[PDB]
Design a protein around this ligand. Sequence first.
Ligand SMILES: [Mg+2]
Ligand SMILES: [Mg+2]
Ligand SMILES: [Mg+2]
Ligand SMILES: [Mg+2]
Lengths: 218, 218
Amino acid sequence: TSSPVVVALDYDNRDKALAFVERIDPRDCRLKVGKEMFTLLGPQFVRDLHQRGFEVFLDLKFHDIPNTTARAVAAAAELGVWMVNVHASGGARMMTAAREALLPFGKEAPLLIAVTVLTSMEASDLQDLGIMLSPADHAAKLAALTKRCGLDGVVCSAQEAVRFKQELGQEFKLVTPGIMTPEQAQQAGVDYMVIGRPVTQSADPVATLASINASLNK
Amino acid sequence: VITSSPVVVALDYDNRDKALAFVERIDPRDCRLKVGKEMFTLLGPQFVRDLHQRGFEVFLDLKFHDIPNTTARAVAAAAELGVWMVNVHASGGARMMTAAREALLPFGKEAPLLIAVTVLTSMEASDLQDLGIMLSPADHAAKLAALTKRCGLDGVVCSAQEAVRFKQELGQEFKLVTPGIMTPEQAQQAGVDYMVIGRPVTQSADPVATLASINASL
Ligand SMILES: [Mg+2]
Ligand SMILES: [Mg+2]
Ligand SMILES: [Mg+2]
Ligand SMILES: [Mg+2]
């Protein structure tokens, strides 16, 4: 697909999940598999989506020692996923090890994206941890580290996309976490946008996606 | 059938047959098992079920680090899977750890031990500085361990080098899990409750005899 849309599958049941996926079409969007779904269903669920033609963002936010994170990212590449993420809080050596583990996969390597600051973190949450920079500023610091380590991009809200494209450049991918419309967020510089209930709770998911996609550059 | 051993053997295989060949050699009276990010990404929760069916208690070592509600749902998923221990990153902050604690309350005494990673064993001061953390690994770990205790979690992952300090500061009931210069016997002397051991057992010539030699010293 050339759509920048990535639909979040936040189901707690495999029946419902694949009932939705049956409705829509892989030519129209990609899919995100997060921590709960994966913990409940495992990589077989990812294989189910691949067998249905979809490209998948595996959103497990790996955060471990460098060698383990590298092996996990390589495991995800062996699963065939399109995108995988790690925590930039794991540090430069961890992010570098993950990048090097994907080198041999060549053009089959998933996009390797870092989480910087979680959307839930406020300054009071950060200060407990010894962090005195604001969420946005700490995120900018971790995003610069991510780029220096050669990763493909970061998870970044649409509200920070202009700042981050300016500071980090056009090639460095911005993926939203999942107020701007999709077209506004694309204008801000978002490369891939995660969309959840607007699509999965739509009475007509295909028509919701068709109208979203009609508003976006491809 | 519960082990008296404090040993938890890390299953870091890239192949199910090799892992289960190991698991068949050993016995659940002699150790617990740890399932981490690599094997869980390859095999998912069915692999945990296969270990349970063989009578083992399992440390599900996925180091959950996400927004509070997502981490809570993942921790509850692990509890429904029936695992013995599960961990989270203290770096996710207090509200995330509290959310995870609250998610386990409905599971009561069947809930897994809920343990926080503080500082990863791989991290040196220079790795932390890049993140804006100016404390030594040991002192940042102590800060995050205090926060973990204040949030009501059951213990932390901590090196044996810091166990005497942590038992003094945080008390006897607060569990210390080493991640794997101190011998198992010394680690136990220093107050370690559970010790993860990986390649020294799984990659040894004779893993059963290696594990026996470790248990004989404990
Ligand atoms: Mg690809
Ligand atoms: Mg046997
Ligand atoms: Mg046996
Ligand atoms: Mg238990």
